[PDB]
Amino acid sequence: SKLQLKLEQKMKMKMAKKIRLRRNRLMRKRKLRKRGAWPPSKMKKLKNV
Amino acid sequence: LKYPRRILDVYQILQSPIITEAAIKNIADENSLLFTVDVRADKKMIREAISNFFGVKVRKVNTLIRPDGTKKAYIMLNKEYNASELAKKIGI
Amino acid sequence: AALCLTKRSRSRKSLARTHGFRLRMSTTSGRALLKRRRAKGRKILCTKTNPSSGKRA
Amino acid sequence: NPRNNLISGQRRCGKGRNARGIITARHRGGGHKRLYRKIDFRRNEKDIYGKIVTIEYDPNRNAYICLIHYGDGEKRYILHPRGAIIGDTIVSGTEVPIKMGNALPLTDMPLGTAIHNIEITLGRGGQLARAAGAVAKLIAKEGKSATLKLPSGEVRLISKNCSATVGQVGNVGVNQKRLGRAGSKRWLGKRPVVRGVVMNPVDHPHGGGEGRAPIGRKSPTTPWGYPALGRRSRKRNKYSDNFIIRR
C-alpha cells in the first residue's frame, strides 16, 4: 500500500519534472532568442568568427 | 452571431492574377498560384472565396503587402488539384 | 564623442507621440495650430507614423 | 523569509521630488529601488498575543522593523524596541501589562515611562517619536489630556485616549555609524547640495563677486529671500496645545 503511494508521488515527480524541465528549456530558448544568439545555423555559420 | 473582422464586399475581395514567369514557376513547382487582392482582406475571407467560386480545396494562403499599396496573395491549393489544369481554364 | 548634431535615429513612434496628430488634437492650442495649417493650405499638417504599415509608394 | 506578500509592492518611484515636475524638495535622486515596508502602526487586533520571529532591515527607516505573527493566522510588521528578544511575545490591548514591545492606550498606564509610538489624535496610524531611538516620556495626566515629553526637549499635553507602544525604540547605534566612504551619501538618493556663496545673484541672494564672498546681506538668507537664522517659521495661532517649547 505504501509503495503504491510512493509510485503515485513518483508519478507526480515525473509529471512535474517534465513540466518544470520543459518550462526551463523553453525559457532558455527565449533567453537565447532575445539576446540574438539562439539558432544553431546562425551559430554554426559563425563558429569561425 | 459569427461576425468577420470587417465586412468588405466579398465579390471584389480578389482583383487580378499575376502573369509573371515566377508565377508559372509557382504553378509548376509549388501547386500554387498568384492573386492580387486589396489591402482590406484576410486569410479567412480570401480562403473562403477560393473554395466557393473555383471549387477547389485551398491548402494555405500566404499574403504580403506590396509598397505600391496593393496586396499580393500566394494561394497554395491541395495536392488533389493541379494548379496547371485549373489555371489554363482561366487563361494563365 | 558625438557632434553638435540634433536630430538622430529616434523611432517615429515616439516622434508621433509628441508631434503627431493625437497630442496635436488633445489641446486647444494644437487644434489652433491645425486652424493655421488648414487655413494656410499645407498638404501635410502633421509629421507622423502609422501603427500598421510604412508607406504607399 | 523574504517576499512576505506584505512588502506591498507598488510605490511612487524611488525617492521622488516632483510636484508638477519642478524640483521642490531639493537634492533627491539615485540609489536602489528601496521597496517600502507596509508596517502595522495602528494595531487593530487588541488582546491577542503575537511572537517576534524576524528583525528585517527596512531601507525606508533609520531603525529596523520586525515581523510579528499571531495566534490567529496573520502577519504584520512593527517597530521593534530596544530589547526585542527573538521569540518574545507582544500583545496590544487596553489592560495589557507594561512590557518592552507591546501597545496600550495612554490612559491605563503609570507616568514616567519610555514609549516610542504614540498618537496625536484617535484613528490615525502613528505619528510621533518613531525614529531610530526616539523615546517619549510621560509627565502626569489630566482630565482629557496628558503632558508628554517627546524627544526634542518638548512637552505636549495630548488626547489621553491615544494608542502607544511602550518601549525605547532600538537601533540607537546609527548615531555613530559613519558614512566615511564619502559617496555613500549618494547611495541614499541624496544628491550634493551647492552652497550659497558660490552661486550667482540670479540664483541665491548671496551670489558674490571676486573671491570667497562674505555673506553681504544683513542676515544670512535662504535662496528664496527669507532670513535663515532665528526667524521662527510657525503660524501664530494653530493649536496652543504645547506647554513650553523648552528648546
Add this chain to the structure above:
RNA sequence: GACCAGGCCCGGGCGACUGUUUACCAAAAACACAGGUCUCCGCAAAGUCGUAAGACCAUGUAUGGGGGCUGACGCCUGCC
C-alpha cells in the same frame, strides 16, 4: 632582440582624497565631498510650486526633514 610595454628622486604652495565644471580658447587653487556648527520645524510639521483645489516634503515623524557657513584628520577657534 620586432610590435607591445612605469622614467625617477629631493623640496615647497594650494586643494585631504576618488570625482564634477565653462558642448566649440579656461579642468583649476574653482564646485562637490565625508566631518563640524548655528538655526527653523510636533505632523492639519516647517520649507517649495501653484490665484485655488492640491502636490513634493512623506505613505517619512527630531538618531528625521529644510536652510546658512566651513570643509577629512590633529591642536585649538580669542576680544567686542
Add this chain to the structure above:
RNA sequence: CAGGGCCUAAGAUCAGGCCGAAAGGCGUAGUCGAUGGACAACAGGUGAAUAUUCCUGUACUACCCCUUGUUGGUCCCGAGGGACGGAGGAGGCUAGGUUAGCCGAAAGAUGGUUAUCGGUUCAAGGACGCAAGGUGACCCUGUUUUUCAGGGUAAGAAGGGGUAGAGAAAAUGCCUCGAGCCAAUGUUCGAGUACCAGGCGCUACGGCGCUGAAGUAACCGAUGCCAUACUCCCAGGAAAAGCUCGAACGACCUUCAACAAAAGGGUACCUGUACCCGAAACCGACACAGGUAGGUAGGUAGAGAAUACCUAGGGGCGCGA
C-alpha cells in the same frame, strides 16, 4: 520569428469629485503605454531579388469532432506563485580549438623528402535516466573537520499528508510518513537510399549530371549552461496578467449541456519581412579622415577582446602619370 488580438512600470489620459476669468489645474476607479512579465520550429534543399516564411523530413502550441465518468459549470471574489540586488571565486560540463587515429588524393621541373594537402558534420524535439558537482539534520570514532568507513535518533531535506481556532484554499500552531533531491551534460530515435573529399561527361566554359570512402579518441577550454547554485555585504534590490488551488455571498445556461483526460484526424487571426545597418543608402547640407544600441569571437606568440601576421569573409580607399 518581432510587435497587436494578453499583462502591467515610469508616464499620459482621466467617468464621476474638488478647484478655477475662459482655456483648463488637481485627483480616484477605469483605459492606454515595452525598454519588462506570459506564450508554440528546428535541420537540409530551392532560388536574378524571399527564407526559422516556399518544398521535404521530423515536432510543438490553441480549439473542434470522435470514446469513459461527472451533475453542475464560467466569471467576480480568498490565496500561493509570477517575483527579480551587487560583487566574488571554485566546481561539473557543453560551444570552439589543437593533436592523434581513419579515408581520399598528391611529385607541386630546386639538395633531400611525404614529414604534404583536404574531410573527420549533424539541430529542434520524443523517450529513458545523474556523479567523482551542489544540496540531505545532530554527536563520537580514523584521516588536514574534509572525499569515505561505522553506530544511533524517529523528522532531520525535495516533498507530501492529517488536524485546531470564525478557518474551503492559504497562513499560523501541533502530529506523522518519507534518505534522498536538483540541473546542465549524456545514450537511443530523429539521422541517412542527407551532407561531404575525390573521380566520372559536356561546356553559352557561368555549372549541371552519375557515383561516393572515414565520419572516432584524447588534451585544452569558454566571457555560454548548471545558476535567481552557494558565500559575503549594505546601499536591502518593480508591478500586473498568464499558471495553480479554493467554501459562502453575487450575475447567466442547463441536459446528450458543461467539465477532466486518453490515443487518432481536422483547422491555423493582423502587421513587419527586400536592401544599407562599425554605413556611399542612418545622423553630420556632401558618395564628408566624425557618430550610432545589441549578437557571433578562428590560428600562432602573448595573461589578454591590446599587439604583430594570417584562415573564413570582404577590399585595394573614384583622379592618374
Add this chain to the structure above:
RNA sequence: GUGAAACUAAGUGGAGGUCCGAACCGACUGAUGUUGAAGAAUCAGCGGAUGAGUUGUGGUUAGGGGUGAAAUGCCACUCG
C-alpha cells in the same frame, strides 16, 4: 597566553569610492589642420575604467521658466 580577557603568528577569504591596462567614457599637452577630410576633428602619447560608472528604449520638468557636484553652464550649431 592566563581561571576568562587584551593581543599575535599561519592559512581561508575577496573588500576597495585600490592599482596597471583593453572595449567604453572623457578631452591634459604638443604638432597638423585654419576658403580644414571635419562649423571642433586627425595623429602621437593622456585621466577614469566595479563606480559619485557608461549606454540603449520609453518618459519628466518649458522661458516673469526648467535644470545646474554652480561655469552664467545647458535647454535643437542660438542663451545675462
